[PDB]
Amino acid sequence: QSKRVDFCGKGYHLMSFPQSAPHGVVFLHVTYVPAQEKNFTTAPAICHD
Amino acid sequence: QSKRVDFCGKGYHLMSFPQSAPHGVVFLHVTYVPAQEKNFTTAPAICHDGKAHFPREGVFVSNGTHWFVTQRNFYEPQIITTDNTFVSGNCDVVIGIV
Amino acid sequence: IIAYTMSLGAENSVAYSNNSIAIPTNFTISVTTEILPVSMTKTSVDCTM
Amino acid sequence: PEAEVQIDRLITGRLQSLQTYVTQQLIRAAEIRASANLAATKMSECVLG
Amino acid sequence: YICGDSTECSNLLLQYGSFCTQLKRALTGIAVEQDKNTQEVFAQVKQIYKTPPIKYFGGFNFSQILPDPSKPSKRSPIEDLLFNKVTLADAGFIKQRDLICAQKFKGLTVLPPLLTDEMIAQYTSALLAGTITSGWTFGAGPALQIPFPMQMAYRFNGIGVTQNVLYENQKLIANQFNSAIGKIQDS
């Protein structure tokens, strides 16, 4: 599994499957694509006591 | 953010900024460079009462009197707790345990 | 104009021992440039001219 | 008038031979450059990290 | 190469003119490119690092890869073995029955490289001293010393293996490493 961005397809890479082709190879890059985001209010730290 | 060494500039890579150029591209590689290091006495493990203690994320260092856990790329000493360390084995098998 | 054997680099002996470690207490945010070619000038040649 | 065309035949032979040699040297130099870029990448990513 | 250099044959290469200069430019570019290739591969450090005079690294024996000072080449046993297994045919020297390098008399010379074998060996020695005494820290800033078992315990965490696996089997891992380095010369 590769952490290289867009080396193994667009998105967060999970798996890849080779397939034989005439004079070449075809990869089926299984990537994790985020979807349906929602806005939230964030903070760098929480002050308790 | 690339973990490949010297692929995105010298140092620990943080960001890069492309710039347009005639017949080319110019990258501005923002890297993290450590500086102002100090010598510390280290140990692979801490022997408390027969158990061997190893750091979860950091490193055991000493200032000469007391031992601390600090993170690996920045000096930030912390008290050696069971939250910072994990227990594996006993004290008889680790070479250099203190 | 002088001629010389090239200085291959600075000389540094790392203070190695079996129980000493060096950890930085500060840091430096460094920005460096990398100029790298992409394309070249497209030319077209007339045969008979 | 006849030695000129004989040596022009020979000189064009040596011109073609030298141009062929430099074309193969440029192709092999591109191959060695690709191998050396791979070697430098392996040095930086295997030895320095 | 074209003309016998005892003749007016060279007075007809002016009829073609810009062709020999184009080869001399192209071969000069190839030569500078080869020197650039060697410089990019081996000059990865700006400082020449040295090992400590006590070569004890927690049981890991690096004597077959560190340079041997008892030999004038200042190379490792593996490097001294590698230069002996390549039947080298360069002629990058001034020294003048005949061998294959009698092709110099036809105008075909060999230029010596900018970095000699000793300087490449010193770059390799600096890289080895850095990666033994400092880990990956010398390649991303200043060299930071660390014990080599502690370095290997950092390197076990990079592959998903906890630190106590190394320290409870340090002698075994050192013996496996020393056996595996010794099989490189045999292979």
Side-chain angles (χ1 to χ4, degrees), chain B residues 61-96:
Chain B
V61 299
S62 171
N63 61 359
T65 61
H66 301 102
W67 289 87
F68 303 97
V69 183
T70 175
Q71 65 181 285
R72 265 146 164 159
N73 289 303
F74 189 80
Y75 182 65
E76 186 183 59
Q78 299 181 57
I79 299 301
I80 299 167
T81 76
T82 60
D83 291 331
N84 289 329
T85 68
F86 68 96
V87 176
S88 179
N90 61 43
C91 300
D92 294 332
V93 298
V94 178
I95 299 167

PDB file of all heavy atoms in Angstrom, chain B residues 61-96:
ATOM      1  N   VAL B  61      16.088   9.652  27.999  1.00  0.00           N
ATOM      2  CA  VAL B  61      17.288  10.472  28.077  1.00  0.00           C
ATOM      3  C   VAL B  61      17.517  10.876  29.523  1.00  0.00           C
ATOM      4  O   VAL B  61      16.613  10.827  30.358  1.00  0.00           O
ATOM      5  CB  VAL B  61      17.221  11.731  27.190  1.00  0.00           C
ATOM      6  CG1 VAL B  61      17.062  11.349  25.747  1.00  0.00           C
ATOM      7  CG2 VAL B  61      16.086  12.633  27.635  1.00  0.00           C
ATOM      8  N   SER B  62      18.752  11.275  29.811  1.00  0.00           N
ATOM      9  CA  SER B  62      19.129  11.718  31.143  1.00  0.00           C
ATOM     10  C   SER B  62      19.931  13.002  31.044  1.00  0.00           C
ATOM     11  O   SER B  62      20.748  13.166  30.134  1.00  0.00           O
ATOM     12  CB  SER B  62      19.951  10.656  31.877  1.00  0.00           C
ATOM     13  OG  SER B  62      20.482  11.173  33.082  1.00  0.00           O
ATOM     14  N   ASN B  63      19.692  13.909  31.984  1.00  0.00           N
ATOM     15  CA  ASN B  63      20.493  15.116  32.127  1.00  0.00           C
ATOM     16  C   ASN B  63      21.666  14.934  33.086  1.00  0.00           C
ATOM     17  O   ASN B  63      22.327  15.917  33.434  1.00  0.00           O
ATOM     18  CB  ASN B  63      19.603  16.294  32.552  1.00  0.00           C
ATOM     19  CG  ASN B  63      18.908  16.085  33.901  1.00  0.00           C
ATOM     20  OD1 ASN B  63      19.051  15.053  34.558  1.00  0.00           O
ATOM     21  ND2 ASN B  63      18.149  17.091  34.319  1.00  0.00           N
ATOM     22  N   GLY B  64      21.932  13.702  33.512  1.00  0.00           N
ATOM     23  CA  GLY B  64      22.960  13.401  34.475  1.00  0.00           C
ATOM     24  C   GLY B  64      22.440  13.002  35.841  1.00  0.00           C
ATOM     25  O   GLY B  64      23.117  12.250  36.551  1.00  0.00           O
ATOM     26  N   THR B  65      21.258  13.479  36.223  1.00  0.00           N
ATOM     27  CA  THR B  65      20.664  13.155  37.515  1.00  0.00           C
ATOM     28  C   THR B  65      19.337  12.427  37.382  1.00  0.00           C
ATOM     29  O   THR B  65      19.113  11.428  38.076  1.00  0.00           O
ATOM     30  CB  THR B  65      20.467  14.434  38.348  1.00  0.00           C
ATOM     31  OG1 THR B  65      19.581  15.325  37.658  1.00  0.00           O
ATOM     32  CG2 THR B  65      21.797  15.132  38.593  1.00  0.00           C
ATOM     33  N   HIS B  66      18.451  12.895  36.510  1.00  0.00           N
ATOM     34  CA  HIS B  66      17.118  12.333  36.362  1.00  0.00           C
ATOM     35  C   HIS B  66      16.918  11.843  34.936  1.00  0.00           C
ATOM     36  O   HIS B  66      17.528  12.359  33.997  1.00  0.00           O
ATOM     37  CB  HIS B  66      16.043  13.369  36.704  1.00  0.00           C
ATOM     38  CG  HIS B  66      16.146  13.909  38.096  1.00  0.00           C
ATOM     39  ND1 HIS B  66      16.681  15.148  38.374  1.00  0.00           N
ATOM     40  CD2 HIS B  66      15.781  13.380  39.287  1.00  0.00           C
ATOM     41  CE1 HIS B  66      16.642  15.358  39.677  1.00  0.00           C
ATOM     42  NE2 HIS B  66      16.101  14.301  40.255  1.00  0.00           N
ATOM     43  N   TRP B  67      16.053  10.846  34.779  1.00  0.00           N
ATOM     44  CA  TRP B  67      15.723  10.301  33.470  1.00  0.00           C
ATOM     45  C   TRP B  67      14.350  10.792  33.033  1.00  0.00           C
ATOM     46  O   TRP B  67      13.448  10.963  33.857  1.00  0.00           O
ATOM     47  CB  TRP B  67      15.745   8.775  33.481  1.00  0.00           C
ATOM     48  CG  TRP B  67      17.106   8.186  33.593  1.00  0.00           C
ATOM     49  CD1 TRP B  67      17.787   7.915  34.740  1.00  0.00           C
ATOM     50  CD2 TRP B  67      17.952   7.778  32.517  1.00  0.00           C
ATOM     51  NE1 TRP B  67      19.011   7.371  34.445  1.00  0.00           N
ATOM     52  CE2 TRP B  67      19.136   7.278  33.085  1.00  0.00           C
ATOM     53  CE3 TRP B  67      17.825   7.793  31.127  1.00  0.00           C
ATOM     54  CZ2 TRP B  67      20.186   6.794  32.312  1.00  0.00           C
ATOM     55  CZ3 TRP B  67      18.866   7.315  30.363  1.00  0.00           C
ATOM     56  CH2 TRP B  67      20.033   6.824  30.956  1.00  0.00           C
ATOM     57  N   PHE B  68      14.197  11.015  31.729  1.00  0.00           N
ATOM     58  CA  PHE B  68      12.966  11.547  31.171  1.00  0.00           C
ATOM     59  C   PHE B  68      12.627  10.826  29.875  1.00  0.00           C
ATOM     60  O   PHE B  68      13.469  10.158  29.272  1.00  0.00           O
ATOM     61  CB  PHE B  68      13.063  13.050  30.887  1.00  0.00           C
ATOM     62  CG  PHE B  68      13.411  13.877  32.084  1.00  0.00           C
ATOM     63  CD1 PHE B  68      14.718  14.269  32.315  1.00  0.00           C
ATOM     64  CD2 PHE B  68      12.425  14.284  32.968  1.00  0.00           C
ATOM     65  CE1 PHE B  68      15.041  15.039  33.415  1.00  0.00           C
ATOM     66  CE2 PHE B  68      12.740  15.053  34.070  1.00  0.00           C
ATOM     67  CZ  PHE B  68      14.049  15.431  34.292  1.00  0.00           C
ATOM     68  N   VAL B  69      11.376  10.978  29.451  1.00  0.00           N
ATOM     69  CA  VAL B  69      10.935  10.595  28.115  1.00  0.00           C
ATOM     70  C   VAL B  69      10.716  11.869  27.317  1.00  0.00           C
ATOM     71  O   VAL B  69       9.971  12.757  27.746  1.00  0.00           O
ATOM     72  CB  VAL B  69       9.645   9.759  28.143  1.00  0.00           C
ATOM     73  CG1 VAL B  69       9.262   9.333  26.739  1.00  0.00           C
ATOM     74  CG2 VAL B  69       9.814   8.556  29.011  1.00  0.00           C
ATOM     75  N   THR B  70      11.366  11.962  26.165  1.00  0.00           N
ATOM     76  CA  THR B  70      11.148  13.061  25.242  1.00  0.00           C
ATOM     77  C   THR B  70      10.858  12.501  23.860  1.00  0.00           C
ATOM     78  O   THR B  70      11.219  11.365  23.548  1.00  0.00           O
ATOM     79  CB  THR B  70      12.354  14.006  25.189  1.00  0.00           C
ATOM     80  OG1 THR B  70      12.140  15.002  24.183  1.00  0.00           O
ATOM     81  CG2 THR B  70      13.617  13.244  24.877  1.00  0.00           C
ATOM     82  N   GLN B  71      10.175  13.296  23.045  1.00  0.00           N
ATOM     83  CA  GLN B  71       9.922  12.895  21.672  1.00  0.00           C
ATOM     84  C   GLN B  71      11.214  12.951  20.859  1.00  0.00           C
ATOM     85  O   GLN B  71      12.192  13.596  21.245  1.00  0.00           O
ATOM     86  CB  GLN B  71       8.829  13.768  21.058  1.00  0.00           C
ATOM     87  CG  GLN B  71       9.187  15.221  20.919  1.00  0.00           C
ATOM     88  CD  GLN B  71       8.067  16.032  20.325  1.00  0.00           C
ATOM     89  OE1 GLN B  71       7.807  15.966  19.128  1.00  0.00           O
ATOM     90  NE2 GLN B  71       7.390  16.806  21.162  1.00  0.00           N
ATOM     91  N   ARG B  72      11.208  12.252  19.725  1.00  0.00           N
ATOM     92  CA  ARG B  72      12.458  11.826  19.103  1.00  0.00           C
ATOM     93  C   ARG B  72      13.152  12.963  18.362  1.00  0.00           C
ATOM     94  O   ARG B  72      14.385  12.982  18.263  1.00  0.00           O
ATOM     95  CB  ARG B  72      12.172  10.660  18.162  1.00  0.00           C
ATOM     96  CG  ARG B  72      12.389   9.309  18.802  1.00  0.00           C
ATOM     97  CD  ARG B  72      11.392   8.295  18.269  1.00  0.00           C
ATOM     98  NE  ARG B  72      11.795   6.930  18.573  1.00  0.00           N
ATOM     99  CZ  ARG B  72      10.972   5.890  18.596  1.00  0.00           C
ATOM    100  NH1 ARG B  72       9.685   6.021  18.320  1.00  0.00           N
ATOM    101  NH2 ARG B  72      11.451   4.692  18.911  1.00  0.00           N
ATOM    102  N   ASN B  73      12.388  13.914  17.831  1.00  0.00           N
ATOM    103  CA  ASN B  73      12.937  14.963  16.980  1.00  0.00           C
ATOM    104  C   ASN B  73      12.913  16.340  17.629  1.00  0.00           C
ATOM    105  O   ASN B  73      13.168  17.335  16.946  1.00  0.00           O
ATOM    106  CB  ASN B  73      12.184  15.005  15.650  1.00  0.00           C
ATOM    107  CG  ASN B  73      12.485  13.809  14.777  1.00  0.00           C
ATOM    108  OD1 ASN B  73      13.640  13.538  14.454  1.00  0.00           O
ATOM    109  ND2 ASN B  73      11.446  13.080  14.391  1.00  0.00           N
ATOM    110  N   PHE B  74      12.617  16.420  18.923  1.00  0.00           N
ATOM    111  CA  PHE B  74      12.547  17.700  19.623  1.00  0.00           C
ATOM    112  C   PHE B  74      12.711  17.417  21.105  1.00  0.00           C
ATOM    113  O   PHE B  74      12.087  16.489  21.624  1.00  0.00           O
ATOM    114  CB  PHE B  74      11.218  18.401  19.343  1.00  0.00           C
ATOM    115  CG  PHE B  74      11.151  19.811  19.847  1.00  0.00           C
ATOM    116  CD1 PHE B  74      11.731  20.841  19.128  1.00  0.00           C
ATOM    117  CD2 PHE B  74      10.494  20.109  21.027  1.00  0.00           C
ATOM    118  CE1 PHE B  74      11.667  22.143  19.583  1.00  0.00           C
ATOM    119  CE2 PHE B  74      10.425  21.409  21.488  1.00  0.00           C
ATOM    120  CZ  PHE B  74      11.013  22.427  20.764  1.00  0.00           C
ATOM    121  N   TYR B  75      13.549  18.187  21.790  1.00  0.00           N
ATOM    122  CA  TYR B  75      13.747  17.944  23.212  1.00  0.00           C
ATOM    123  C   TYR B  75      12.580  18.511  24.010  1.00  0.00           C
ATOM    124  O   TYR B  75      12.382  19.729  24.062  1.00  0.00           O
ATOM    125  CB  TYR B  75      15.064  18.539  23.691  1.00  0.00           C
ATOM    126  CG  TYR B  75      15.321  18.257  25.151  1.00  0.00           C
ATOM    127  CD1 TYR B  75      15.524  16.958  25.601  1.00  0.00           C
ATOM    128  CD2 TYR B  75      15.369  19.288  26.079  1.00  0.00           C
ATOM    129  CE1 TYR B  75      15.750  16.693  26.937  1.00  0.00           C
ATOM    130  CE2 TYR B  75      15.603  19.034  27.416  1.00  0.00           C
ATOM    131  CZ  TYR B  75      15.795  17.735  27.837  1.00  0.00           C
ATOM    132  OH  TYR B  75      16.027  17.478  29.168  1.00  0.00           O
ATOM    133  N   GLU B  76      11.816  17.622  24.631  1.00  0.00           N
ATOM    134  CA  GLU B  76      10.677  17.976  25.465  1.00  0.00           C
ATOM    135  C   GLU B  76      10.574  16.934  26.573  1.00  0.00           C
ATOM    136  O   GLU B  76       9.865  15.933  26.420  1.00  0.00           O
ATOM    137  CB  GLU B  76       9.396  18.035  24.633  1.00  0.00           C
ATOM    138  CG  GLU B  76       8.171  18.529  25.379  1.00  0.00           C
ATOM    139  CD  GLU B  76       6.924  18.500  24.521  1.00  0.00           C
ATOM    140  OE1 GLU B  76       6.559  17.408  24.040  1.00  0.00           O
ATOM    141  OE2 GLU B  76       6.313  19.571  24.321  1.00  0.00           O
ATOM    142  N   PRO B  77      11.280  17.122  27.688  1.00  0.00           N
ATOM    143  CA  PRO B  77      11.367  16.058  28.693  1.00  0.00           C
ATOM    144  C   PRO B  77      10.084  15.916  29.496  1.00  0.00           C
ATOM    145  O   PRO B  77       9.442  16.903  29.863  1.00  0.00           O
ATOM    146  CB  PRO B  77      12.532  16.507  29.581  1.00  0.00           C
ATOM    147  CG  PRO B  77      12.556  17.982  29.443  1.00  0.00           C
ATOM    148  CD  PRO B  77      12.080  18.302  28.056  1.00  0.00           C
ATOM    149  N   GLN B  78       9.714  14.666  29.760  1.00  0.00           N
ATOM    150  CA  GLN B  78       8.513  14.333  30.510  1.00  0.00           C
ATOM    151  C   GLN B  78       8.860  13.301  31.571  1.00  0.00           C
ATOM    152  O   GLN B  78       9.829  12.554  31.440  1.00  0.00           O
ATOM    153  CB  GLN B  78       7.408  13.783  29.599  1.00  0.00           C
ATOM    154  CG  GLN B  78       6.932  14.745  28.530  1.00  0.00           C
ATOM    155  CD  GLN B  78       5.826  14.162  27.682  1.00  0.00           C
ATOM    156  OE1 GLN B  78       4.786  13.753  28.196  1.00  0.00           O
ATOM    157  NE2 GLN B  78       6.051  14.107  26.376  1.00  0.00           N
ATOM    158  N   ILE B  79       8.055  13.274  32.633  1.00  0.00           N
ATOM    159  CA  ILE B  79       8.244  12.301  33.701  1.00  0.00           C
ATOM    160  C   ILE B  79       7.892  10.912  33.184  1.00  0.00           C
ATOM    161  O   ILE B  79       6.889  10.729  32.483  1.00  0.00           O
ATOM    162  CB  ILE B  79       7.391  12.693  34.921  1.00  0.00           C
ATOM    163  CG1 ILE B  79       7.816  14.066  35.441  1.00  0.00           C
ATOM    164  CG2 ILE B  79       7.515  11.673  36.043  1.00  0.00           C
ATOM    165  CD1 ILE B  79       9.266  14.138  35.864  1.00  0.00           C
ATOM    166  N   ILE B  80       8.742   9.933  33.489  1.00  0.00           N
ATOM    167  CA  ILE B  80       8.534   8.559  33.045  1.00  0.00           C
ATOM    168  C   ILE B  80       7.344   7.976  33.797  1.00  0.00           C
ATOM    169  O   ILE B  80       7.433   7.690  34.995  1.00  0.00           O
ATOM    170  CB  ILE B  80       9.788   7.705  33.270  1.00  0.00           C
ATOM    171  CG1 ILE B  80      10.965   8.256  32.476  1.00  0.00           C
ATOM    172  CG2 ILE B  80       9.534   6.269  32.856  1.00  0.00           C
ATOM    173  CD1 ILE B  80      12.278   7.661  32.877  1.00  0.00           C
ATOM    174  N   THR B  81       6.224   7.814  33.099  1.00  0.00           N
ATOM    175  CA  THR B  81       5.028   7.215  33.667  1.00  0.00           C
ATOM    176  C   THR B  81       4.702   5.930  32.923  1.00  0.00           C
ATOM    177  O   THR B  81       5.353   5.571  31.940  1.00  0.00           O
ATOM    178  CB  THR B  81       3.821   8.163  33.612  1.00  0.00           C
ATOM    179  OG1 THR B  81       3.314   8.215  32.272  1.00  0.00           O
ATOM    180  CG2 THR B  81       4.197   9.561  34.066  1.00  0.00           C
ATOM    181  N   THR B  82       3.674   5.231  33.408  1.00  0.00           N
ATOM    182  CA  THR B  82       3.157   4.077  32.684  1.00  0.00           C
ATOM    183  C   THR B  82       2.297   4.481  31.496  1.00  0.00           C
ATOM    184  O   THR B  82       1.969   3.623  30.671  1.00  0.00           O
ATOM    185  CB  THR B  82       2.348   3.175  33.617  1.00  0.00           C
ATOM    186  OG1 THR B  82       1.241   3.906  34.152  1.00  0.00           O
ATOM    187  CG2 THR B  82       3.218   2.676  34.757  1.00  0.00           C
ATOM    188  N   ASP B  83       1.911   5.751  31.401  1.00  0.00           N
ATOM    189  CA  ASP B  83       1.263   6.266  30.204  1.00  0.00           C
ATOM    190  C   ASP B  83       2.249   6.510  29.073  1.00  0.00           C
ATOM    191  O   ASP B  83       1.879   6.389  27.901  1.00  0.00           O
ATOM    192  CB  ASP B  83       0.521   7.565  30.525  1.00  0.00           C
ATOM    193  CG  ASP B  83      -0.682   7.342  31.417  1.00  0.00           C
ATOM    194  OD1 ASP B  83      -1.275   6.245  31.351  1.00  0.00           O
ATOM    195  OD2 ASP B  83      -1.032   8.260  32.186  1.00  0.00           O
ATOM    196  N   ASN B  84       3.494   6.856  29.401  1.00  0.00           N
ATOM    197  CA  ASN B  84       4.527   7.065  28.397  1.00  0.00           C
ATOM    198  C   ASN B  84       5.218   5.780  27.977  1.00  0.00           C
ATOM    199  O   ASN B  84       5.726   5.707  26.853  1.00  0.00           O
ATOM    200  CB  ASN B  84       5.585   8.041  28.917  1.00  0.00           C
ATOM    201  CG  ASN B  84       5.077   9.461  29.002  1.00  0.00           C
ATOM    202  OD1 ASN B  84       4.233   9.878  28.211  1.00  0.00           O
ATOM    203  ND2 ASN B  84       5.594  10.217  29.962  1.00  0.00           N
ATOM    204  N   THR B  85       5.255   4.774  28.844  1.00  0.00           N
ATOM    205  CA  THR B  85       6.009   3.554  28.607  1.00  0.00           C
ATOM    206  C   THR B  85       5.083   2.350  28.506  1.00  0.00           C
ATOM    207  O   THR B  85       3.914   2.396  28.891  1.00  0.00           O
ATOM    208  CB  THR B  85       7.037   3.323  29.721  1.00  0.00           C
ATOM    209  OG1 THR B  85       6.356   3.032  30.947  1.00  0.00           O
ATOM    210  CG2 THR B  85       7.910   4.549  29.912  1.00  0.00           C
ATOM    211  N   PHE B  86       5.628   1.256  27.977  1.00  0.00           N
ATOM    212  CA  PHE B  86       4.950  -0.031  27.986  1.00  0.00           C
ATOM    213  C   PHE B  86       5.903  -1.089  28.524  1.00  0.00           C
ATOM    214  O   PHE B  86       7.124  -0.932  28.488  1.00  0.00           O
ATOM    215  CB  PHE B  86       4.406  -0.413  26.592  1.00  0.00           C
ATOM    216  CG  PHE B  86       5.464  -0.721  25.562  1.00  0.00           C
ATOM    217  CD1 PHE B  86       5.855  -2.031  25.313  1.00  0.00           C
ATOM    218  CD2 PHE B  86       6.003   0.289  24.786  1.00  0.00           C
ATOM    219  CE1 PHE B  86       6.807  -2.315  24.355  1.00  0.00           C
ATOM    220  CE2 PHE B  86       6.956   0.010  23.824  1.00  0.00           C
ATOM    221  CZ  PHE B  86       7.353  -1.295  23.606  1.00  0.00           C
ATOM    222  N   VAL B  87       5.323  -2.174  29.028  1.00  0.00           N
ATOM    223  CA  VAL B  87       6.052  -3.214  29.742  1.00  0.00           C
ATOM    224  C   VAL B  87       6.155  -4.444  28.853  1.00  0.00           C
ATOM    225  O   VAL B  87       5.144  -4.922  28.324  1.00  0.00           O
ATOM    226  CB  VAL B  87       5.363  -3.555  31.074  1.00  0.00           C
ATOM    227  CG1 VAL B  87       6.061  -4.709  31.761  1.00  0.00           C
ATOM    228  CG2 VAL B  87       5.335  -2.336  31.975  1.00  0.00           C
ATOM    229  N   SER B  88       7.373  -4.955  28.687  1.00  0.00           N
ATOM    230  CA  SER B  88       7.588  -6.201  27.960  1.00  0.00           C
ATOM    231  C   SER B  88       8.774  -6.929  28.569  1.00  0.00           C
ATOM    232  O   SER B  88       9.874  -6.375  28.634  1.00  0.00           O
ATOM    233  CB  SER B  88       7.828  -5.939  26.475  1.00  0.00           C
ATOM    234  OG  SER B  88       8.048  -7.152  25.780  1.00  0.00           O
ATOM    235  N   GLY B  89       8.549  -8.165  29.008  1.00  0.00           N
ATOM    236  CA  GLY B  89       9.621  -8.983  29.535  1.00  0.00           C
ATOM    237  C   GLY B  89      10.067  -8.549  30.924  1.00  0.00           C
ATOM    238  O   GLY B  89       9.343  -7.889  31.673  1.00  0.00           O
ATOM    239  N   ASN B  90      11.295  -8.939  31.260  1.00  0.00           N
ATOM    240  CA  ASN B  90      11.899  -8.592  32.537  1.00  0.00           C
ATOM    241  C   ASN B  90      13.236  -7.900  32.289  1.00  0.00           C
ATOM    242  O   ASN B  90      13.614  -7.616  31.149  1.00  0.00           O
ATOM    243  CB  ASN B  90      11.984  -9.829  33.458  1.00  0.00           C
ATOM    244  CG  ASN B  90      12.836 -10.980  32.891  1.00  0.00           C
ATOM    245  OD1 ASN B  90      13.918 -10.795  32.335  1.00  0.00           O
ATOM    246  ND2 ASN B  90      12.322 -12.193  33.052  1.00  0.00           N
ATOM    247  N   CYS B  91      13.959  -7.631  33.377  1.00  0.00           N
ATOM    248  CA  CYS B  91      15.171  -6.825  33.308  1.00  0.00           C
ATOM    249  C   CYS B  91      16.416  -7.638  32.980  1.00  0.00           C
ATOM    250  O   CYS B  91      17.498  -7.055  32.865  1.00  0.00           O
ATOM    251  CB  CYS B  91      15.375  -6.095  34.635  1.00  0.00           C
ATOM    252  SG  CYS B  91      14.019  -4.989  35.067  1.00  0.00           S
ATOM    253  N   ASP B  92      16.295  -8.955  32.831  1.00  0.00           N
ATOM    254  CA  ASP B  92      17.465  -9.813  32.693  1.00  0.00           C
ATOM    255  C   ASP B  92      17.929  -9.990  31.254  1.00  0.00           C
ATOM    256  O   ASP B  92      18.995 -10.575  31.038  1.00  0.00           O
ATOM    257  CB  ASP B  92      17.172 -11.187  33.300  1.00  0.00           C
ATOM    258  CG  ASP B  92      16.959 -11.129  34.798  1.00  0.00           C
ATOM    259  OD1 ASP B  92      17.520 -10.220  35.446  1.00  0.00           O
ATOM    260  OD2 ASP B  92      16.229 -11.992  35.330  1.00  0.00           O
ATOM    261  N   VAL B  93      17.175  -9.508  30.269  1.00  0.00           N
ATOM    262  CA  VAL B  93      17.458  -9.803  28.869  1.00  0.00           C
ATOM    263  C   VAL B  93      17.839  -8.578  28.054  1.00  0.00           C
ATOM    264  O   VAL B  93      18.313  -8.738  26.919  1.00  0.00           O
ATOM    265  CB  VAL B  93      16.270 -10.525  28.198  1.00  0.00           C
ATOM    266  CG1 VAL B  93      16.004 -11.855  28.878  1.00  0.00           C
ATOM    267  CG2 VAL B  93      15.033  -9.649  28.239  1.00  0.00           C
ATOM    268  N   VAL B  94      17.659  -7.369  28.573  1.00  0.00           N
ATOM    269  CA  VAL B  94      17.920  -6.148  27.819  1.00  0.00           C
ATOM    270  C   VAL B  94      19.316  -5.657  28.173  1.00  0.00           C
ATOM    271  O   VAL B  94      19.628  -5.442  29.350  1.00  0.00           O
ATOM    272  CB  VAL B  94      16.863  -5.073  28.108  1.00  0.00           C
ATOM    273  CG1 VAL B  94      17.186  -3.793  27.360  1.00  0.00           C
ATOM    274  CG2 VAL B  94      15.487  -5.582  27.729  1.00  0.00           C
ATOM    275  N   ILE B  95      20.154  -5.481  27.158  1.00  0.00           N
ATOM    276  CA  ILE B  95      21.526  -5.028  27.360  1.00  0.00           C
ATOM    277  C   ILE B  95      21.526  -3.511  27.479  1.00  0.00           C
ATOM    278  O   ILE B  95      21.089  -2.806  26.565  1.00  0.00           O
ATOM    279  CB  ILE B  95      22.434  -5.492  26.213  1.00  0.00           C
ATOM    280  CG1 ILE B  95      22.467  -7.018  26.144  1.00  0.00           C
ATOM    281  CG2 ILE B  95      23.836  -4.940  26.389  1.00  0.00           C
ATOM    282  CD1 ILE B  95      23.078  -7.555  24.871  1.00  0.00           C
ATOM    283  N   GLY B  96      22.023  -3.005  28.604  1.00  0.00           N
ATOM    284  CA  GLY B  96      22.079  -1.580  28.838  1.00  0.00           C
ATOM    285  C   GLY B  96      20.931  -1.006  29.633  1.00  0.00           C
ATOM    286  O   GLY B  96      20.807   0.222  29.705  1.00  0.00           O
TER     287      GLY B  96
END
